[PDB]
Amino acid sequence: TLVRPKPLLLKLLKSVGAQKDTYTMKEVLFYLGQYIMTKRLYDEKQQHIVYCSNDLLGDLFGVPSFSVKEHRKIYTMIYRNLV
């Protein structure tokens, strides 16, 4: 099973090194984690909290922040950005 990111999440994925149109969900998480890392969107002191409120990811996901421990919310926010 491969998934097809909608266009804006595609651009987001490519900006940290993804190359195709379709990905396993594992590839999508990998690039999501790279993106949050390289952009430093996490709290320094509570590293599992992501502030994405000023960022394209907050727009795509629909939320101004979340924690990486909210797996179900993260999967749901991803679904919205899949064709």
Add this chain to the structure above:
Amino acid sequence: TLVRPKPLLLKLLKSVGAQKDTYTMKEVLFYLGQYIMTKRLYDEKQQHIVYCSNDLLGDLFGVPSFSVKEHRKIYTMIYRNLV
């Protein structure tokens, strides 16, 4: 965020009490639990394994079995049966 099961997952969900045409991921997972557990698709001896080769569920997931601890696979198999 409301998801909308395609017709087969809907059938599965209805058969274990769901009424709506739309659900939270929270609910979708609950009913699915209900489904597996009320038909005893899981192995008695190693209970994290669900065997669905002889069941409606194997047809919608596309696997002969899966393990409840494989969350990424579960969400992925679920997205293909959603809008």
